[PDB]
Design a protein around this ligand. Sequence first.
Ligand SMILES: *[C@@H]1O[C@H](CO)[C@@H](O)[C@H](O)[C@H]1NC(C)=O
Ligand SMILES: *[C@@H]1O[C@H](CO)[C@@H](O)[C@H](O)[C@H]1NC(C)=O
Ligand SMILES: *[C@@H]1O[C@H](CO)[C@@H](O)[C@H](O)[C@H]1NC(C)=O
Ligand SMILES: *[C@@H]1O[C@H](CO)[C@@H](O)[C@H](O)[C@H]1NC(C)=O
Ligand SMILES: *[C@@H]1O[C@H](CO)[C@@H](O)[C@H](O)[C@H]1NC(C)=O
Ligand SMILES: *[C@@H]1O[C@H](CO)[C@@H](O)[C@H](O)[C@H]1NC(C)=O
Ligand SMILES: *[C@H]1O[C@H](CO)[C@@H](O)[C@H](O)[C@@H]1O
Ligand SMILES: *[C@H]1O[C@H](CO)[C@@H](O)[C@H](O)[C@@H]1O
Ligand SMILES: *[C@H]1O[C@H](CO)[C@@H](O)[C@H](O)[C@@H]1O
Ligand SMILES: *[C@H]1O[C@H](CO)[C@@H](O)[C@H](O)[C@@H]1O
Ligand SMILES: *[C@H]1O[C@H](CO)[C@@H](O)[C@H](O)[C@@H]1O
Ligand SMILES: *[C@H]1O[C@H](CO)[C@@H](O)[C@H](O)[C@@H]1O
Ligand SMILES: *[C@H]1O[C@H](CO)[C@@H](O)[C@H](O)[C@@H]1O
Ligand SMILES: *[C@H]1O[C@H](CO)[C@@H](O)[C@H](O)[C@@H]1O
Ligand SMILES: *[C@H]1O[C@H](CO)[C@@H](O)[C@H](O)[C@@H]1O
Ligand SMILES: *[C@H]1O[C@H](CO)[C@@H](O)[C@H](O)[C@@H]1O
Ligand SMILES: [Ca+2]
Ligand SMILES: [Ca+2]
Ligand SMILES: [Ca+2]
Ligand SMILES: [Ca+2]
Ligand SMILES: [Ca+2]
Ligand SMILES: [Ca+2]
Ligand SMILES: [Ca+2]
Ligand SMILES: [Ca+2]
Ligand SMILES: [Ca+2]
Ligand SMILES: [Ca+2]
Lengths: 365, 365
Amino acid sequence: YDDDWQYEDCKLARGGPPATIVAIDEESRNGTILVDNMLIKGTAGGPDPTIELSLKDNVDYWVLLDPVKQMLFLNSTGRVLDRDPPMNIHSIVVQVQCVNKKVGTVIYHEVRIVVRDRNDNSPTFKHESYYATVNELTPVGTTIFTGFSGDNGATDIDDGPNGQIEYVIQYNPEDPTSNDTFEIPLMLTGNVVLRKRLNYEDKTRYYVIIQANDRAQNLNERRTTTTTLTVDVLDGDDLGPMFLPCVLVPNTRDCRPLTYQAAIPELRTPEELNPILVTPPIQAIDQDRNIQPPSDRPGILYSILVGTPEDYPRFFHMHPRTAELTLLEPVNRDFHQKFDLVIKAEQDNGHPLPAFASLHIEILD
Amino acid sequence: YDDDWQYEDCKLARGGPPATIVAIDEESRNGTILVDNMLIKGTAGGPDPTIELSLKDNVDYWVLLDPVKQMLFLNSTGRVLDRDPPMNIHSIVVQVQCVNKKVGTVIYHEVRIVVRDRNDNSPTFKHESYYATVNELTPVGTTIFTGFSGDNGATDIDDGPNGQIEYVIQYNPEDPTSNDTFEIPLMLTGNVVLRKRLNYEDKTRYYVIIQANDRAQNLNERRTTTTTLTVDVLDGDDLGPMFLPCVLVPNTRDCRPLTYQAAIPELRTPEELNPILVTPPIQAIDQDRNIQPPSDRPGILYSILVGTPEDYPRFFHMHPRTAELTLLEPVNRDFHQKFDLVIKAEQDNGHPLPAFASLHIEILD
Ligand SMILES: *[C@@H]1O[C@H](CO)[C@@H](O)[C@H](O)[C@H]1NC(C)=O
Ligand SMILES: *[C@@H]1O[C@H](CO)[C@@H](O)[C@H](O)[C@H]1NC(C)=O
Ligand SMILES: *[C@@H]1O[C@H](CO)[C@@H](O)[C@H](O)[C@H]1NC(C)=O
Ligand SMILES: *[C@@H]1O[C@H](CO)[C@@H](O)[C@H](O)[C@H]1NC(C)=O
Ligand SMILES: *[C@@H]1O[C@H](CO)[C@@H](O)[C@H](O)[C@H]1NC(C)=O
Ligand SMILES: *[C@@H]1O[C@H](CO)[C@@H](O)[C@H](O)[C@H]1NC(C)=O
Ligand SMILES: *[C@H]1O[C@H](CO)[C@@H](O)[C@H](O)[C@@H]1O
Ligand SMILES: *[C@H]1O[C@H](CO)[C@@H](O)[C@H](O)[C@@H]1O
Ligand SMILES: *[C@H]1O[C@H](CO)[C@@H](O)[C@H](O)[C@@H]1O
Ligand SMILES: *[C@H]1O[C@H](CO)[C@@H](O)[C@H](O)[C@@H]1O
Ligand SMILES: *[C@H]1O[C@H](CO)[C@@H](O)[C@H](O)[C@@H]1O
Ligand SMILES: *[C@H]1O[C@H](CO)[C@@H](O)[C@H](O)[C@@H]1O
Ligand SMILES: *[C@H]1O[C@H](CO)[C@@H](O)[C@H](O)[C@@H]1O
Ligand SMILES: *[C@H]1O[C@H](CO)[C@@H](O)[C@H](O)[C@@H]1O
Ligand SMILES: *[C@H]1O[C@H](CO)[C@@H](O)[C@H](O)[C@@H]1O
Ligand SMILES: *[C@H]1O[C@H](CO)[C@@H](O)[C@H](O)[C@@H]1O
Ligand SMILES: [Ca+2]
Ligand SMILES: [Ca+2]
Ligand SMILES: [Ca+2]
Ligand SMILES: [Ca+2]
Ligand SMILES: [Ca+2]
Ligand SMILES: [Ca+2]
Ligand SMILES: [Ca+2]
Ligand SMILES: [Ca+2]
Ligand SMILES: [Ca+2]
Ligand SMILES: [Ca+2]
């Protein structure tokens, strides 16, 4: 038991916890009052003080004390009280030491100054730009970009909601359909989902403007940074062959074929006549003009699909890769005056998507 | 300093660490020798022993001691020394207590029996079966199933390689193309990737047999469990309309249209004649017969694409949704004897994939 602790000098004349806890905003002005009055019993002033007050553990001298008023001030001339990196000052803790002069006892009064975050930083993207490719056959609802994952996206150095990031697509006045074609359903991840079906024939590149905004409680205080995600559409196999030559029908993408022509002298043999010349030459090309890589491009199979009269298979053979037409036996014109055949060109990859053209063959007297 | 510790009795007559460390396989027989000889100096036998030996900390009585031979045995009658759950006995630790009888000193000799894992457990799948759906337009290389993720896959309760799981596709003799169509490139995840392009018209369900095997060092000792991943293909919009009626060309999927027919009496007015009857009625349907959901199904647009003579737009109008044909002005047969028109039916969804049919119109005297 000690009689020296029975005094009230050096003890706090307030309710609450032993620590004196206060809060100020980061980056507060020099001279900002931290504690207006410590409320420590006793007097440090006068010619016969009963107490002596001083600061201990005043790291980097952030706090100044007036021992008579028992007032603490922020010392920040020439510097900034930054809560964010690189400083990371989330609180300032110091001790007010009080000595009771009558008996020499010492008491420390902790002071904790909580430094409140301001939203003084904007999101920064890891990269200057972002890029994705998407095959045009990709179904709607496919997640086509995850490139903000694993901190490759945006970071904000503020605390709490001030540092939380939401990714949102903006309307792009320079590419008005991009915000209709793509969506970010989960703001917290920034992953981009295909919202509308693509068509390589119509549009092959999109500029998707993606903002990253912080979540400050006050909308007027939120900060925003933008990036562009460039999406290139890759040509997919949604179209089949088209015969050449063709004429485009005005106001359409339908390039219609001609009727191919051939003529066979009656009674001459295949040895004499083959190969049978067709005018213009039968050819077709894939309406998908930029399939990559080249090894994914299909071959085209040519055939005589149907024809009139229906005995044409007795007389004609078409090479399936070259479309070369050969005669199989001599033609007696008493029995066979002409043929009208339908030629098919289709892909050899299980997705035939055929085109059709007519071939007229005259038998000559 | 104590003279009582200057004796060799109760100390180990061997090199190595203070703990006596040995290993046995899990599930070892009752009576399995754990330590053949503790090598403790002194004699516990005879009528004047210099030491006394006993076991301490013998949890659940797994160890038996012969104090004279200094031999330890496994006590496992009626039970199993299981290293795996539910027992989880990875080691057995007991103390051999030695008392030096001349001076009463006590020394404990730790014995650690490491229980080695056997590969006595097979992988178990969380679920009886697994299921995925895949739109047929999905590009090759798409990861189409991740359903083993987050422990929804297979678990093995053995330790180390004995408990590691590899997921591998097996050839399915009941569905021989499924192991060609899908692949698991990362054995450790079991995620399934589309390896070959789908076609709903050809195949709509696959049974993919997926084994989960453990990684026991000896192939003969590895354990395997199988599951089936059922994959259903969803019909996608890769095909356009087809006109009806049609006749299928033998050995093909090409259902060719007829030439539609109409006849218009000369000089009668549109009021008198409309609508112009076409035989058979012009109709088309989507060659994709099971697009889901119904709201994704496109409408069909009908039009007169081209025609001869080329003044037909002065005379005829086709309703784009119903294909109804109307006359726009009376027809003078001195100037117009017949028309041969090409009708197009295409989808209205930006992927027209058109079909074409002929329409012959006679002007009647
Ligand atoms: C900074 O604040 C302290 C405390 O009020 C004050 O003593 C000092 O004069 C101030 N310095 C300047 C340059 O204003
Ligand atoms: C105020 O802070 C600055 C920087 O730490 C320091 O140089 C100065 O000595 C401090 N002033 C006082 C009165 O503690
Ligand atoms: C895209 O931006 C425009 C203009 O702000 C807006 O009308 C439209 O609703 C947006 N589209 C989507 C899918 O949000
Ligand atoms: C089990 O093993 C111990 C130690 O060898 C032995 O004493 C005991 O007889 C054995 N019990 C049976 C039932 O074999
Ligand atoms: C052997 O283990 C069983 C099960 O713990 C126990 O009942 C028995 O008492 C033990 N025997 C000895 C000799 O310790
Ligand atoms: C599928 O299984 C068969 C038979 O084992 C085998 O020939 C074929 O190579 C396998 N396919 C793939 C893609 O591994
Ligand atoms: C693609 O993946 C994202 C998640 O990364 C989903 O949000 C989306 O629905 C799609 O499955
Ligand atoms: C920055 O600006 C964007 C709009 O461009 C807001 O969404 C955000 O709240 C912040 O004010
Ligand atoms: C991201 O995009 C927005 C809108 O174009 C710009 O305001 C910003 O400067 C950044 O380029
Ligand atoms: C990203 O880049 C696009 C142009 O490529 C801009 O329009 C946008 O403002 C952002 O800087
Ligand atoms: C997406 O990336 C392209 C370059 O690949 C840029 O041109 C565009 O501005 C956007 O950043
Ligand atoms: C789908 O996603 C898996 C990983 O989950 C990849 O292994 C695969 O290449 C594809 O991108
Ligand atoms: C179980 O059986 C499979 C083959 O079906 C092996 O891959 C595995 O090593 C284990 O022996
Ligand atoms: C998984 O599939 C394999 C092969 O069909 C079977 O052997 C096993 O019983 C399980 O059904
Ligand atoms: C999974 O299920 C299929 C049949 O649905 C079996 O063939 C296979 O053996 C496994 O049991
Ligand atoms: C995949 O799932 C189907 C049922 O949806 C089963 O029929 C098949 O055996 C496999 O387990
Ligand atoms: Ca700051
Ligand atoms: Ca801040
Ligand atoms: Ca911020
Ligand atoms: Ca294409
Ligand atoms: Ca193609
Ligand atoms: Ca076991
Ligand atoms: Ca085991
Ligand atoms: Ca195992
Ligand atoms: Ca389809
Ligand atoms: Ca369709």
